[PDB]
Amino acid sequence: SFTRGVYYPDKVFRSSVLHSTQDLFLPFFSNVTWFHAIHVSGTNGTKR
Protein backbone atom coordinates (compact mmCIF):
# COMPACT_ATOMS: atom_id res chain seq x y z
CA SER A 1 0.00 0.00 0.00
CA PHE A 2 1.88 3.03 -1.30
CA THR A 3 0.02 6.11 0.00
CA ARG A 4 -3.51 5.57 1.31
CA GLY A 5 -5.43 5.43 4.57
CA VAL A 6 -5.19 9.14 5.40
CA TYR A 7 -8.43 10.30 7.01
CA TYR A 8 -9.68 13.40 8.78
CA PRO A 9 -9.00 12.78 12.50
CA ASP A 10 -11.41 15.47 13.74
CA LYS A 11 -14.47 17.49 12.74
CA VAL A 12 -12.53 20.78 12.46
CA PHE A 13 -12.02 22.67 9.20
CA ARG A 14 -8.57 24.00 8.35
CA SER A 15 -7.17 25.55 5.17
CA SER A 16 -3.79 26.75 3.90
CA VAL A 17 -2.13 25.26 6.99
CA LEU A 18 -0.15 22.13 7.84
CA HIS A 19 -1.30 20.35 11.01
CA SER A 20 0.54 17.51 12.76
CA THR A 21 -1.74 14.83 14.24
CA GLN A 22 -0.73 11.88 16.42
CA ASP A 23 -3.37 9.23 15.75
CA LEU A 24 -3.79 5.66 14.52
CA PHE A 25 -2.73 5.79 10.86
CA LEU A 26 -1.75 3.34 8.15
CA PRO A 27 2.01 3.79 7.57
CA PHE A 28 2.97 5.06 4.14
CA PHE A 29 4.34 2.40 1.77
CA SER A 30 3.07 -0.25 4.19
CA ASN A 31 2.32 -3.92 3.48
CA VAL A 32 -1.34 -4.93 3.21
CA THR A 33 -2.76 -8.37 2.53
CA TRP A 34 -4.09 -9.29 -0.91
CA PHE A 35 -6.87 -11.79 -0.25
CA HIS A 36 -8.73 -12.83 -3.40
CA ALA A 37 -11.33 -15.30 -2.05
CA ILE A 38 -12.28 -16.23 -5.64
CA HIS A 39 -9.50 -18.06 -7.49
CA VAL A 40 -10.74 -18.79 -11.01
CA SER A 41 -7.90 -20.88 -12.43
CA GLY A 42 -7.49 -24.04 -14.48
CA THR A 43 -8.78 -25.31 -17.79
CA ASN A 44 -12.41 -24.72 -16.73
CA GLY A 45 -11.82 -22.58 -13.63
CA THR A 46 -13.04 -22.94 -10.07
CA LYS A 47 -14.65 -20.92 -7.27
CA ARG A 48 -12.26 -21.36 -4.35
Binding site: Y8, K11, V12, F13, R14, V17
Partner: protein
Protein backbone atom coordinates in the same frame (compact mmCIF):
# COMPACT_ATOMS: atom_id res chain seq x y z
CA UNK B 1 -16.97 19.22 10.04
CA UNK B 2 -18.67 20.70 13.10
CA UNK B 3 -16.63 23.92 13.30
CA UNK B 4 -13.36 25.48 12.15
CA UNK B 5 -9.93 26.43 13.40
CA UNK B 6 -7.00 28.68 12.48
CA UNK B 7 -3.21 28.36 12.31
CA UNK B 8 -2.88 28.84 16.09
CA UNK B 9 -5.44 26.11 16.90
CA UNK B 10 -8.14 28.61 17.89
CA UNK B 11 -11.76 28.58 16.75
CA UNK B 12 -12.38 30.70 13.65
CA UNK B 13 -15.56 29.22 12.11
CA UNK B 14 -18.61 27.43 13.51
CA UNK B 15 -21.77 25.83 12.13
CA UNK B 16 -25.19 26.34 13.67
CA UNK B 17 -26.14 22.90 15.07
CA UNK B 18 -29.77 23.44 14.00
CA UNK B 19 -29.34 24.85 10.48
CA UNK B 20 -26.45 24.12 8.11
CA UNK B 21 -24.63 27.41 7.57
CA UNK B 22 -21.10 28.73 8.07
CA UNK B 23 -20.39 31.78 10.24
CA UNK B 24 -16.92 33.03 11.13
CA UNK B 25 -16.11 34.12 14.68
CA UNK B 26 -13.86 37.03 15.63
CA UNK B 27 -13.16 38.59 19.04
CA UNK B 28 -15.17 41.70 19.78
CA UNK B 29 -13.29 44.99 19.72
CA UNK B 30 -10.69 45.36 22.46
CA UNK B 31 -7.41 47.14 22.98
CA UNK B 32 -5.30 49.31 25.21
CA UNK B 33 -6.25 52.65 26.74
CA UNK B 34 -3.57 55.33 26.43
CA UNK B 35 -3.86 58.73 28.10
CA UNK B 36 -2.42 61.83 26.42
CA UNK B 37 -1.42 64.24 29.19
CA UNK B 38 0.68 67.42 28.82
CA UNK B 39 1.63 67.02 32.49
CA UNK B 40 -0.06 67.76 35.81
CA UNK B 41 2.50 70.53 36.31
CA UNK B 42 1.32 72.14 33.05
CA UNK B 43 -2.42 71.42 32.85
CA UNK B 44 -5.16 68.88 33.59
CA UNK B 45 -6.83 68.45 30.19
CA UNK B 46 -6.13 65.03 28.66
CA UNK B 47 -7.08 62.97 25.61
CA UNK B 48 -7.73 59.22 25.73
CA UNK B 49 -6.65 56.91 22.89
Amino acid sequence: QQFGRDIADTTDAVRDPQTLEILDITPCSFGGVSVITPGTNTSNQVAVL
